[PDB]
Design a protein around this ligand. Structure first.
Ligand SMILES: [Mg+2]
Ligand SMILES: [Mg+2]
Ligand SMILES: [Mg+2]
Ligand SMILES: [Mg+2]
Ligand SMILES: [Mg+2]
Ligand SMILES: [Mg+2]
Ligand SMILES: [Mg+2]
Ligand SMILES: [Mg+2]
Ligand SMILES: [Mg+2]
Ligand SMILES: [Mg+2]
Ligand SMILES: [Mg+2]
Ligand SMILES: [Mg+2]
Ligand SMILES: [Mg+2]
Ligand SMILES: [Mg+2]
Ligand SMILES: [Mg+2]
Ligand SMILES: [Mg+2]
Ligand SMILES: [Mg+2]
Ligand SMILES: [Mg+2]
Ligand SMILES: [Mg+2]
Ligand SMILES: [Mg+2]
Ligand SMILES: [Mg+2]
Ligand SMILES: [Mg+2]
Ligand SMILES: [Mg+2]
Ligand SMILES: [Mg+2]
Ligand SMILES: [Mg+2]
Ligand SMILES: [Mg+2]
Ligand SMILES: [Mg+2]
Ligand SMILES: [Mg+2]
Ligand SMILES: [Mg+2]
Ligand SMILES: [Mg+2]
Ligand SMILES: [Mg+2]
Ligand SMILES: [Mg+2]
Ligand SMILES: [Mg+2]
Ligand SMILES: [Mg+2]
Ligand SMILES: [Mg+2]
Ligand SMILES: [Zn+2]
Lengths: 53, 112, 43, 122
RNA sequence: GUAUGAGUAGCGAAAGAAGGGUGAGAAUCCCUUCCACCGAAUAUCUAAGGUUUCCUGAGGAAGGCUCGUCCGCUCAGGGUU
RNA sequence: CCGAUAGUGAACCAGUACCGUGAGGGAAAGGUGAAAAGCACCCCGGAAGGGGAGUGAAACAGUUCCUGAAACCGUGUGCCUA
RNA sequence: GUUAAGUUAGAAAGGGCGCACGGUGGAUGCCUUGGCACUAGGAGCCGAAGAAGGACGGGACUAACACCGAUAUGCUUUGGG
């Protein structure tokens, strides 16, 4: 339950191939014309589907 | 003359490995789009990288008179800084080291 | 668990005090050797 | 149904608090997975208001909490939550069949990244 | 001095919810209502021990196993008849 | 004879901090510049921290500040790799 | 132009080698405020007229070092400058 050999820089870098994080699924609001997440209420112009919640 | 502007943040209290994971998203993108990316990524390093990128934009137009609408991000990297060394009391009278690591963040913006 | 050190003001002064050191031939040797090192506190 | 990270006793005591705040304030702020469960217990509670029987009133009185929504200057008569449900909220939806609530997504919370929503009563 | 194990083990018995407020920033600070826990105690005094931890006004570098606008933390004044 | 792991334990508020009930044990820690002339002023920020401007022979000398190797951590790229 | 047989390029989720530019860290070089070993000369004791060693105090602001002792960051006199 204890490592036998130390991990090289190659193997320590190969394992982190999948330790990245994805790009957010943003979009563009029609009214305020700035970036926004899909299916979410627009934070600044404070509206959704053009209703001004 | 001057084609690019930079800004750094010396000795920010965040581990370099945790801030290096958000930098990889905004490398090579336009400043308008990159700002939105850091807004919708729910990590703790977003408010710090966002505040550095905006500063590099600010002195890219006040000092060198560039265009805010025609900028990209070409250089973005995180360096290590002076770590703080602490201890945590474990069982049976022993102690264990804890490293409170800092970082330096650099963002460079330029025309395209 | 009951640990070894149970503090008390009177019990400390009447065993390791100064006037306890000065009332012995070997006690006065302890102050003499602590002055040689120039220690800040005696007894 | 779904658990909410709490035992059976604490789950019931939590659905009764949230379902009452949505009646009193008509607009609250919960997490996404927590707002998808008081959606069911509120609409099933408006339905008892669209009947108006004493039997239905006594059944809903076993779920609503007991706090004063607001004081009405008739001589002061405090108004309770059960009166608001059976005299105000219920007559509003006399024509709509189902779906007295809507859920609107907001975005992650700073402390723990929880996904927050707005759940309204319209 | 710096690595590997690795963003892995752990985050030290416990019920919280919503609405207002302050704030650059709030699950964690203040106020209100509801709910829950102890009750020969998880209540009220007083010894030993500690030695300023006690009050007011400011602060968020470090300490707080997270956050903090808060603190038994930092600064400056007070307080024991 | 030594030149900051050396020379006294101590070149620096050292028998100090810390450890122990007590006798007792006992460290780490030097260097901006010739001269503070220690960065009026403008911009991003709550601040920290930066980018210009200025002093200086030098700011890649900016309150662990002469020189700044190696381990260790990154960014870009010429050749190779499922 | 279709079919059949055959031959050969290219790729990078990531990685290796070379180079360029940085960060951390504090070696090395230069330096000396401090030490070590001796030579020549001097001196080899202080105290009931209260010692060696300390506690507490004295400054306009004083936490610490150094100096002094309710005559307390100094008093008198004799010489130097
Ligand atoms: Mg042990
Ligand atoms: Mg123990
Ligand atoms: Mg005894
Ligand atoms: Mg039960
Ligand atoms: Mg280390
Ligand atoms: Mg594992
Ligand atoms: Mg596992
Ligand atoms: Mg706990
Ligand atoms: Mg709120
Ligand atoms: Mg009970
Ligand atoms: Mg006492
Ligand atoms: Mg207090
Ligand atoms: Mg913290
Ligand atoms: Mg305090
Ligand atoms: Mg030495
Ligand atoms: Mg050296
Ligand atoms: Mg002690
Ligand atoms: Mg000098
Ligand atoms: Mg500057
Ligand atoms: Mg400002
Ligand atoms: Mg500044
Ligand atoms: Mg300059
Ligand atoms: Mg010049
Ligand atoms: Mg030079
Ligand atoms: Mg020069
Ligand atoms: Mg020089
Ligand atoms: Mg240097
Ligand atoms: Mg190197
Ligand atoms: Mg490749
Ligand atoms: Mg000498
Ligand atoms: Mg003699
Ligand atoms: Mg006389
Ligand atoms: Mg003194
Ligand atoms: Mg003083
Ligand atoms: Mg004179
Ligand atoms: Zn919008």
């Amino acid at each position: 339950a204890v490592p036998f050999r130390r991990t090289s820089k190659a193997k320590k870098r190969k394992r982190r191939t999948h330790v990245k994080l994805q790009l957010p699924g943003m979009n563009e609001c029609s009214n305020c014309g700035e970036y926004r997440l899909s299916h979410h209420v627009c934070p600044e112009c404070g509206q959704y589907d053009g209703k001004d919640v | 003359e001057v084609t690019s502007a930079k800004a750094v943040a010396k000795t920010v209290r965040i581990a370099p490995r945790k801030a290096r994971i958000v930098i990889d998203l905004i490398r090579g993108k336009q400043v308008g789009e990159a700002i939105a990316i850091l807004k919708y990524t729910p990590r703790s390093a977003s408010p710090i990288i966002e505040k550095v990128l905006k500063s590099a934009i600010a002195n890219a137009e006040h000092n060198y008179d560039l265009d805010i609408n025609n900028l990209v991000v070409e250089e973005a990297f995180v360096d290590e800084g002076p770590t703080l060394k602490r201890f945590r009391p474990r069982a049976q009278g022993r102690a264990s080291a804890i490293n409170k690591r800092t970082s330096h963040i650099t963002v460079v913006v330029s025309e395209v | 668990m009951k640990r070894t050190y149970q503090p008390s003001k009177r019990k400390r002064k009447k065993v390791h005090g100064f006037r306890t050191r000065m009332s012995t031939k070997n006690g006065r040797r302890v102050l003499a050797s602590r002055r040689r090192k120039g220690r800040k506190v005696l007894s | 149904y779904r658990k909410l990270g709490r035992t059976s006793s604490q789950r019931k005591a939590l659905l009764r608090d949230l379902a009452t705040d949505l009646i009193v304030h008509e607009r609250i702020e919960t997490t996404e997975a927590r707002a998808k469960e008081i959606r069911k217990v509120v609409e099933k509670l408006i339905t008892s208001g669209k009947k108006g029987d004493l039997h239905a009133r006594r059944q809903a009185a076993a779920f609503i909490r007991h706090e004063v929504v607001e004081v009405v200057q008739v001589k002061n008569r405090p108004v309770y939550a059960l009166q608001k449900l059976f005299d105000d909220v219920a007559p509003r939806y006399a024509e709509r069949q189902g779906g007295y609530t809507r859920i609107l997504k907001k975005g992650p919370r700073r402390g723990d990244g929880a996904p927050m929503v707005i759940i309204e009563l319209v």
